[PDB]
Amino acid sequence: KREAEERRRFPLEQRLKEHIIGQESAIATVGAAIRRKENGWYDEEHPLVFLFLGSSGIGKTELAKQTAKYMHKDAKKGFIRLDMSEFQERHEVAKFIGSPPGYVGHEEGGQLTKKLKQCPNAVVLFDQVDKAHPDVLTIMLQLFDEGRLTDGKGKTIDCKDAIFIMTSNVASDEIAQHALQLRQEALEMSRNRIAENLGDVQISDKITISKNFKENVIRPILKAHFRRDEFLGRINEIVYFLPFCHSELIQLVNKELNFWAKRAKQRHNITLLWDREVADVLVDGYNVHYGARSIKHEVERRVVNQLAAAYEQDLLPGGCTLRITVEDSDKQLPKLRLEIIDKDSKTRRLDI
Amino acid sequence: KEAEERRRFPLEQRLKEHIIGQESAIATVGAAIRRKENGWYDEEHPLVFLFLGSSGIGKTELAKQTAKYMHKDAKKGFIRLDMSEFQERHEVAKFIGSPPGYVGHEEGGQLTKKLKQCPNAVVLFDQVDKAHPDVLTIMLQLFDEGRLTDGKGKTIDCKDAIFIMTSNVASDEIAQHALQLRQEALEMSRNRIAENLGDVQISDKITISKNFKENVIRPILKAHFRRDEFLGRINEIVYFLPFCHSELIQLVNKELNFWAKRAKQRHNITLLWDREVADVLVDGYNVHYGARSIKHEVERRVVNQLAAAYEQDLLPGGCTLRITVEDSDKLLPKLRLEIIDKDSKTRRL
Amino acid sequence: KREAEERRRFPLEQRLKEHIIGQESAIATVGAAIRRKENGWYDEEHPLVFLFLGSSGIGKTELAKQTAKYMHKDAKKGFIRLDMSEFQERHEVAKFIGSPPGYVGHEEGGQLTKKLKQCPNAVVLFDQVDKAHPDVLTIMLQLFDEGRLTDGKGKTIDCKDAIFIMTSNVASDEIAQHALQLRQEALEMSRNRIAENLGDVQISDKITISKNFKENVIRPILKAHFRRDEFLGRINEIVYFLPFCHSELIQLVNKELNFWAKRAKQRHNITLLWDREVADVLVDGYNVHYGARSIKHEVERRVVNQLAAAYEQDLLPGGCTLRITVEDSDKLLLPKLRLEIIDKDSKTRRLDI
Numbered sequence A: 001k002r003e004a005e006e007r008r009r010f011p012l013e014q015r016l017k018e019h020i021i022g023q024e025s026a027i028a029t030v031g032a033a034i035r036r037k038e039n040g041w042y043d044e045e046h047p048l049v050f051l052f053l054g055s056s057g058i059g060k061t062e063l064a065k066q067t068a069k070y071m072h073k074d075a076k077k078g079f080i081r082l083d084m085s086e087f088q089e090r091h092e093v094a095k096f097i098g099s100p101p102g103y104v105g106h107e108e109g110g111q112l113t114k115k116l117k118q119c120p121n122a123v124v125l126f127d128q129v130d131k132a133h134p135d136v137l138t139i140m141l142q143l144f145d146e147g148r149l150t151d152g153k154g155k156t157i158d159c160k161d162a163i164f165i166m167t168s169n170v171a172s173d174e175i176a177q178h179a180l181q182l183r184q185e186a187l188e189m190s191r192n193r194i195a196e197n198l199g200d201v202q203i204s205d206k207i208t209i210s211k212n213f214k215e216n217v218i219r220p221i222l223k224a225h226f227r228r229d230e231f232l233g234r235i236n237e238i239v240y241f242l243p244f245c246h247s248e249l250i251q252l253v254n255k256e257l258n259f260w261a262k263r264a265k266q267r268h269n270i271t272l273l274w275d276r277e278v279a280d281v282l283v284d285g286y287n288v289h290y291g292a293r294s295i296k297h298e299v300e301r302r303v304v305n306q307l308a309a310a311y312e313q314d315l316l317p318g319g320c321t322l323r324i325t326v327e328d329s330d331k332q333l334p335k336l337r338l339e340i341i342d343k344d345s346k347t348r349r350l351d352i
Numbered sequence B: 001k002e003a004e005e006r007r008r009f010p011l012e013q014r015l016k017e018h019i020i021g022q023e024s025a026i027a028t029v030g031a032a033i034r035r036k037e038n039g040w041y042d043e044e045h046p047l048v049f050l051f052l053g054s055s056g057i058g059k060t061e062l063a064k065q066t067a068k069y070m071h072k073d074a075k076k077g078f079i080r081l082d083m084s085e086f087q088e089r090h091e092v093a094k095f096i097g098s099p100p101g102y103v104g105h106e107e108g109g110q111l112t113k114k115l116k117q118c119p120n121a122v123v124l125f126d127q128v129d130k131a132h133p134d135v136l137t138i139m140l141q142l143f144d145e146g147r148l149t150d151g152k153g154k155t156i157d158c159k160d161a162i163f164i165m166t167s168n169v170a171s172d173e174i175a176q177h178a179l180q181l182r183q184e185a186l187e188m189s190r191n192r193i194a195e196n197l198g199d200v201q202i203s204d205k206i207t208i209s210k211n212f213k214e215n216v217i218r219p220i221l222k223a224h225f226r227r228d229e230f231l232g233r234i235n236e237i238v239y240f241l242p243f244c245h246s247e248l249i250q251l252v253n254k255e256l257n258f259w260a261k262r263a264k265q266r267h268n269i270t271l272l273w274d275r276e277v278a279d280v281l282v283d284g285y286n287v288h289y290g291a292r293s294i295k296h297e298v299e300r301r302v303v304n305q306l307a308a309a310y311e312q313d314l315l316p317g318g319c320t321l322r323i324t325v326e327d328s329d330k331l332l333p334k335l336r337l338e339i340i341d342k343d344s345k346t347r348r349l
Numbered sequence C: 001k002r003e004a005e006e007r008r009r010f011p012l013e014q015r016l017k018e019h020i021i022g023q024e025s026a027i028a029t030v031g032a033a034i035r036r037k038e039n040g041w042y043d044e045e046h047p048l049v050f051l052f053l054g055s056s057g058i059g060k061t062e063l064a065k066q067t068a069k070y071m072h073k074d075a076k077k078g079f080i081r082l083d084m085s086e087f088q089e090r091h092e093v094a095k096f097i098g099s100p101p102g103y104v105g106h107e108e109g110g111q112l113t114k115k116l117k118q119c120p121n122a123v124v125l126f127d128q129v130d131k132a133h134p135d136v137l138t139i140m141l142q143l144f145d146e147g148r149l150t151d152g153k154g155k156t157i158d159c160k161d162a163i164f165i166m167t168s169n170v171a172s173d174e175i176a177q178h179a180l181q182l183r184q185e186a187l188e189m190s191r192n193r194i195a196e197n198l199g200d201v202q203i204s205d206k207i208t209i210s211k212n213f214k215e216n217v218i219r220p221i222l223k224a225h226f227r228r229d230e231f232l233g234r235i236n237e238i239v240y241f242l243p244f245c246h247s248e249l250i251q252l253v254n255k256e257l258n259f260w261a262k263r264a265k266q267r268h269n270i271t272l273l274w275d276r277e278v279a280d281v282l283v284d285g286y287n288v289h290y291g292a293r294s295i296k297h298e299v300e301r302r303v304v305n306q307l308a309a310a311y312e313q314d315l316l317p318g319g320c321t322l323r324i325t326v327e328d329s330d331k332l333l334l335p336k337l338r339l340e341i342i343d344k345d346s347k348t349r350r351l352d353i
């Protein structure tokens, strides 16, 4: 009975927003799909299958990780990551099932069926399914249609309540092109709205995928790649993803510096402060093609190197406060510098 | 709810902001794209254009600006293939890849991959004159139904694509008949002015007659492309008229505006020019080579000595320049640059 | 019994004459061969092979598409349309039968053989067979002989019940010239019978191609192009297509204007109406060499562009009706047609574009 109050007081959409920012249309559709599971309007005879498409770096595995953290407490037993990049050969179906009878290796058992029987409510993610050979997809079509497995010993494993996600990268640049095209049309009409001063109607930058772009472009490509129409017809949910916008990327820079300041405060009580020009230069030091990995390890390289060289020669006492500021030589146009806030509010420089 | 943009700033304005003197061609392609975007065009067959004109008249840039209008500065929506590579019969393999059992089979076809990644992409076949006629034979399916089949047997879809082919066939004939029609129009306007009923002159564009389109140009089109099938699949055969003097002035003004914009962005130097410099730059116009004949002649009378000025440090930042005609060469021909200083003093460079 | 009843109440000729207009000898000969196939009056060990010869933009590809749509309601599976422009070189035979064992596409198999393996009663349309290399055409020797084909994995396939239709424009100019000459001769004889007061005989314009023109002109150019006097032997019929006359082109103009009226009504509730001068101005600028395709483009720029523009400035509300009217100032009789709104009180209002 308490699960209803925990659901209403703590909706998952806010928490999935607060872990991963951006992809608000994707967050909304996975929130609607998960909400249409537990309130009694669902299919028990079909396992819930999520098919996560999108580009790189922007976040699919972490989003599904937070989904499994939401539905299951433990991230070990209820959270299984099968790497379909490993399975690229015909006999790897044995790793799905087991050895044939009359042959050795049958005594070890089947790994996936043991994972699904030991943890029936677990969340299983398939990473890099594009390189999987077609026959392991066929042994997955057995689960994808029926949800029941038989191993070489003959034992029966039911997998309905388990939650299945496949993360793929087919037509990532294509969905990126449709997102960028609809965003370009939105920008070109929004500049007309600014010119006509039409501020009465609220403007949302939660731009979603168009309805007729996905059937014109993406569906014949997926029919050519997956080779089965029944695979594309049997899917419970397909979630498409979009490249990050401009202000959301500034929020991402703020988010990365936010956990870096949180880690400094938790380890040695250090409070960081940042400027908008630092965020501008970091967005300049970002790569669109592989997403937020660029901004994550760029913030890891830029600011953490300077505080690490400060800690190596003990220029960072605990309990003080730091500011990061673009250097005045590079503020014309990039080198950034650290400044210590004194009790007299004097900006101490560094000589490392 | 983008149709309001189509009400406020159509294709004709965007093309006339980049392409001048081709108002008939702009009107034709704008009407066809307007018919396509309003849901008023059959989606069974793709829209096919064939631009015929003299060189340097703006056919390739009209195709490029058309692609910019559709896909908004996106690299994928503009599939450009130069057909000048496709001079032999086996070059068709470059479209579709090799058959099974052959080298390059797993790579697949190039145009097929580019049209699979974007089916509504604008495909520009540059220089369809320059390809072999048997290479154009593969265009029959792709223009009739947008149905191209791969090396591996997969079939792509091009039902909503826009194909634009540039050519130089009958360029001498088109240019000669256009200048002859402008000449007789000028003569008949002057003759009607002799009784003071000739201020109408003509329309802005020369209406190329259907009799001239069928009895003259079409035999050369049939003779070079060797096939009435390929000409039948072409939805709009769009003719480009050569420039007359009024838009030659505007064209020289556009080039000089670009070279004034090359400064002031990184040197803070302005460039100002009179009308007689525009007259003596229109004077060096070659009919055979088109606007490109102007485009690399303008610097020959404007920028090169200006380049020498940048080698002689005669242009600091903040100068005010003026290109005028030489007094001794007023034959009409060299030009000379001057700097006007803040106390209204002219210094000849 | 039920299929015989269905063929009795409406033959193939009525359905395809609805879908394709003109070409009466072509549809008659094709429907006769199909009727021989359907009623069990044919040698089952030989597949039925057609070569569609005629001008461009006449309807050969459309007629064979309509025939394959008549055979199966599912035209995705039982209609194998292979385009011969991909097959301009000899090694493109590897697209048909697949690669030999030991090469990159061997496990994929032959592309034609797998589609014929899915269904062996399919209509295979070899589009533009003039364009393929003749050594590629040498594989249709064993396709047309006993209806068998060997895959790259050694598994032969049977195609005894399949129907193979090729289309080409070999001798397009000769067929069009001879058909125009025969039309001129028939019109001369008709006006002579009018001048001789002979009009009691119903002489329809079903012009037939003589055997002497087939054997004198079409056969040497066919043997010069296909370069083998054994490929043409296995072709069961040479179906002949003719350029349109005036009334057929008028019916084509009315057909496409009916199509645009149907689209306007079913998408935006717009009723269209036109006069006979509309058909005259949509037939006058006709090119024979582009056939029906030329007529289509004449409907496209003269009328449909004005419809799209008049939609763009928002002059076409739901339920309104338009009349297409020839221009008075071009009564030049490229002209122009005007769109006139008819209101509730049957008044004519010209619309500005």
Ligand SMILES: Nc1ncnc2c1ncn2[C@@H]1O[C@H](COP(=O)(O)OP(=O)(O)OP(=O)(O)O)[C@@H](O)[C@H]1O
Binding pocket: A019, A020, A021, A022, A055, A056, A057, A058, A059, A060, A061, A062, A063, A167, A291, A292, A293, A296
């Ligand atoms: N939008 C984001 N917000 C916050 N952190 C992010 C974001 N994107 C990536 N990260 C961080 O970077 C890591 C990258 O993992 P993530 O699952 O987000 O990437 P991905 O795009 O799914 O990866 P891959 O392309 O390899 O499938 C995350 O674990 C997280 O720490």
Ligand SMILES: Nc1ncnc2c1ncn2[C@@H]1O[C@H](COP(=O)(O)OP(=O)(O)OP(=O)(O)O)[C@@H](O)[C@H]1O
Binding pocket: B018, B019, B020, B021, B022, B054, B055, B056, B057, B058, B059, B060, B061, B062, B166, B167, B168, B251, B290, B291, B292, B295
């Ligand atoms: N309408 C125009 N008027 C004047 N100059 C133009 C116009 N369009 C383009 N130009 C300029 O002239 C150059 C030549 O144009 P473009 O490359 O389109 O050639 P073209 O007319 O298609 O001829 P060709 O087919 O022989 O290449 C362009 O690079 C541009 O700088």
Ligand SMILES: Nc1ncnc2c1ncn2[C@@H]1O[C@H](COP(=O)(O)OP(=O)(O)OP(=O)(O)O)[C@@H](O)[C@H]1O
Binding pocket: B144, B229, B232, C019, C020, C021, C022, C023, C055, C056, C057, C058, C059, C060, C061, C062, C063, C167, C168, C169, C291, C292, C293
């Ligand atoms: N006789 C006709 N009756 C009705 N529609 C026709 C006719 N001929 C052509 N069409 C229309 O024009 C299109 C072109 O026809 P189709 O491709 O069959 O012509 P074709 O003469 O066989 O072609 P090709 O140029 O390859 O020889 C058809 O799909 C149809 O829409």
Ligand SMILES: [Mg+2]
Binding pocket: A059, A060, A061, A062
């Ligand atoms: Mg990931």
Ligand SMILES: [Mg+2]
Binding pocket: B059, B060, B126, B166
């Ligand atoms: Mg060019």
Ligand SMILES: [Mg+2]
Binding pocket: C057, C060, C061, C062, C167
């Ligand atoms: Mg055809």
